Design a protein around this ligand. Sequence first.
Ligand SMILES: Nc1ncnc2c1ncn2[C@@H]1O[C@H](COP(=O)(O)OP(=O)(O)NP(=O)(O)O)[C@@H](O)[C@H]1O
Ligand SMILES: Nc1ncnc2c1ncn2[C@@H]1O[C@H](COP(=O)(O)OP(=O)(O)NP(=O)(O)O)[C@@H](O)[C@H]1O
Ligand SMILES: Nc1ncnc2c1ncn2[C@@H]1O[C@H](COP(=O)(O)OP(=O)(O)NP(=O)(O)O)[C@@H](O)[C@H]1O
Ligand SMILES: [Mg+2]
Ligand SMILES: [Mg+2]
Ligand SMILES: [Mg+2]
Lengths: 314, 315, 308
Amino acid sequence: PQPISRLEQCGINANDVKKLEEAGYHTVEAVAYAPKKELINIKGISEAKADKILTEAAKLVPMGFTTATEFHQRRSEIIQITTGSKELDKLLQGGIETGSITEMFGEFRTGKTQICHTLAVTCQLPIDRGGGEGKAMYIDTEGTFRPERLLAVAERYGLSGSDVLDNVAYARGFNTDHQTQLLYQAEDMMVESRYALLIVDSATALYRTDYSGRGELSARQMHLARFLRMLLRLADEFGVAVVITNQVVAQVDGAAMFADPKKPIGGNIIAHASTTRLYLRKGRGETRICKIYDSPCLPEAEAMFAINADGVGD
Amino acid sequence: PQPISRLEQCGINANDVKKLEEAGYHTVEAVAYAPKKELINIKGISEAKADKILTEAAKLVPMGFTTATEFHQRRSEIIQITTGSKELDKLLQGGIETGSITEMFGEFRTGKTQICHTLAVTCQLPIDRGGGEGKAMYIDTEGTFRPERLLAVAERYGLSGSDVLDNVAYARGFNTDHQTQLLYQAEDMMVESRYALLIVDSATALYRTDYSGRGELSARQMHLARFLRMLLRLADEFGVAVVITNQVVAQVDGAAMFAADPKKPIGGNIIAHASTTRLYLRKGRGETRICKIYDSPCLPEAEAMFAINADGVGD
Amino acid sequence: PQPISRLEQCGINANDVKKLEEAGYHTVEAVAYAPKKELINIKGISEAKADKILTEAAKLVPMGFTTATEFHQRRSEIIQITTGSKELDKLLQGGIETGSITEMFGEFRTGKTQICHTLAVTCQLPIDRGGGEGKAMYIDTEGTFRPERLLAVAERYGLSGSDVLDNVAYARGFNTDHQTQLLYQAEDMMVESRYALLIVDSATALYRTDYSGRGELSARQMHLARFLRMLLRLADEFGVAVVITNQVVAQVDGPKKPIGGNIIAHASTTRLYLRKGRGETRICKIYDSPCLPEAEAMFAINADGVGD
DNA sequence: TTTTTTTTTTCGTCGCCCACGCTTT
DNA sequence: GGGCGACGTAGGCTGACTC
DNA sequence: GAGTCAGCCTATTCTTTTTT
Ligand SMILES: Nc1ncnc2c1ncn2[C@@H]1O[C@H](COP(=O)(O)OP(=O)(O)NP(=O)(O)O)[C@@H](O)[C@H]1O
Ligand SMILES: Nc1ncnc2c1ncn2[C@@H]1O[C@H](COP(=O)(O)OP(=O)(O)NP(=O)(O)O)[C@@H](O)[C@H]1O
Ligand SMILES: Nc1ncnc2c1ncn2[C@@H]1O[C@H](COP(=O)(O)OP(=O)(O)NP(=O)(O)O)[C@@H](O)[C@H]1O
Ligand SMILES: [Mg+2]
Ligand SMILES: [Mg+2]
Ligand SMILES: [Mg+2]
């Protein structure tokens, strides 16, 4: 919420920060969250330019030791976008939370993109009846973004039309390097607007196909880590929920389970860098089962939703 | 689709274009959908050259953020090919869609190569009766391409008969590889003439046999993923409909099932997420099959019914 | 039908061409119909030795796109061996075509080997009478190959005798492994003389007996999906007319299902179904076929093979 | 003239089988 | 009705025999 | 009395469920 126009001051001109702009940084909270090395590789930045930039960015960002009675009253006003369902909102104690990565893995025909389609329409509702009012972002990397399914949920939620269809930025990631450069552009839109969501559908779809052979595994999880850290600097900067959708693999070995293995794709890189992880599952007919699979404050309980003609629901 | 020669400017000499055309990059929308680490693995191309290519290609291909209103206006002009059956059409809301991979699994004699023979005569129809006004590629992998069915679906409708059999490219895949190489030779054929179909008679047929499992399960699924990736590049670059046919493996146990040989598609979880829509051809009575939408991001899970008939899939 | 000796060129020494003959590959076609990954596993070929094999092979045998009107004038030269009948020759549109597998399941006594004893005599008739032109090759596996039935089918079409019995190669399977190494010695005699049929009777017979239990249902169906693949190779190069004989199990759900499962049901163009009727008259219903409608007919096993 | 640091990372499902058993004036 | 077992368990070396 | 020829740990022990 602070563009770099309040940092082009105090012994710093705007020409040097003009380099920061094309370096990726568009916020005062984006250079302060960045280390010395990352901003020292930029052509132009002298070590002094670097230490001055950091010390003057520290001025406008709280970087210190707060108490836990001041962090409790900052998360008592956190916005929680509601999913379409009520049995899925009770399980999550309020819908997807803002300022945290929320993975949704599952296998197929489970509802990983129908939740991401009823979330891009509820995150446009007043906070008093749903999500936090603001636009959304759909970074679709599978080809499945149906705008005809947004007008179905925005016929039950009372939202009208092309208004819903308009406050949804949509981008299509074609490879694994254009996925990560589609965020240096998203951080340019989120500061000249008010977004309240960032859906990255199948965030790990273009990793299964780009890096393959076990000789490209340390080079894949060193890119996934960068991705999920760049996606964690968008959730702390502007406070936007970051639902990321994942996939599953099948460990073909000793059962040691007695049973069908799912074990979502992405190792201990997308597992240790994710706040909540919902495990969607197939059920009888149109009913699905969503089990919380990891969360710092939520019980490991189960729920029940259904993919209606209006997105997920009851 | 603009050829690679279209980007030949800005200090990109013709040798670069030529050495990019030998790696399977024949379109300017095939070098902008390619990661840099894959343009680096090409002889001659260095880091600076790769960056130059990837910068001068993103100026010729739209790569950015667009609202969901200029995507709901480029999606209302999606030509949907008729499948030959009204019931099948209603279930699929109009017919196979352009720009997507549409899988069709099911046990033997269900109809998966007859909805692949009535589909390649319908894509050559005018758009007023359902079609694409183009040609129909047919990369068959099992040897069951019979052009005497394209000469009956061409009499049910009204086409000539000698002009429907001329607008059908045919190629037989003989290995797990080669099958992909046909998709690399397919970019050449599709840049020049207008194609509107990419039928693959059995994608996961040569994967079995060529791979023995467990030992090569991992290897087979990184070769299948690199096949369903070309199938998506060709679809999102040429705007064609990549129909595709799958086989079936019976869950011998563990599935903990009960009914008759519950059957699941082969291919694992890498043909399950890659495919946009999945249709399940089942069999009923004498000449009456069943079709249930397994997976689809827009279509409700329904259940239609069709008949192989003598003039191709109908009702 | 090009001996692999033709590949002996461009850095292809007799060391390499020899190396190919003891792995199975005997025709240059069989090498272009072969994955890259399979070449390295053969000893002596490491990285670019294998690649160079395929590069010159791909120029000899053509593998690429072609119009579907120059495939019609390839499907109009199919030999279509007659199965010594007329009611079974109108059900099929001219008997067993060449270049495609054809399973014939049924039950005991139906006549799956009495049609394999008529397609070993009517595959040597002149192409005018309705047969092919060459030599049958019976690969029997159950032990039922009585050569007094392919001599009483020869005293019906005017064929002399011993000569009809001189063009029918024979081999017993013995094991599930011996019957797939018999397809590698068949590719050695198809490249010299002209063969027009591979009866391979009693397939999937030593699979229900050698590989037994749900424990082997995996290695049975990747040793049967490879047998049915080597069988599709000899049907593509030499244009032979591979016939296959299945058996059945009894569905105990609540009922004659052929053995093999979804492995033998998928890798098959046409698929007949013999069934016993009254007296010596059976029923042949086309289970599966990619072009031919699904109907049924009536044949009869009289004293000279399949008759009417 | 010299004087050795420093680990990283998971990925991939497959293959159907086997018939039984008379009983009722 | 009731049935399960399958890498990529390598490699260096203890059991064990083999001369 | 070392040569092949071998059969297994250097490390343990989670999933977690559908499908008719
Ligand atoms: N000309 C025809 N007239 C009527 N029915 C036909 C005709 N040709 C084929 N059929 C029927 O269509 C059925 C389906 O054949 P096909 O479409 O090849 O099945 P499939 O599922 O593709 N088989 P496979 O590829 O071996 O798994 C056949 O089994 C026949 O019953
Ligand atoms: N309009 C609709 N009405 C009812 N049900 C629908 C509708 N659209 C989709 N569905 C159902 O919801 C599912 C949507 O697909 P979804 O489960 O979101 O894809 P996914 O799990 O991401 N699969 P993939 O991306 O291929 O791994 C379908 O399989 C249908 O069962
Ligand atoms: N010379 C003959 N004259 C008349 N009928 C004959 C003659 N030879 C055989 N048959 C009949 O043909 C039947 C079928 O034999 P065959 O073709 O071996 O059956 P099958 O079902 O293939 N046997 P199997 O392989 O054990 O399942 C015999 O059982 C006899 O009834
Ligand atoms: Mg979706
Ligand atoms: Mg077929
Ligand atoms: Mg027999």
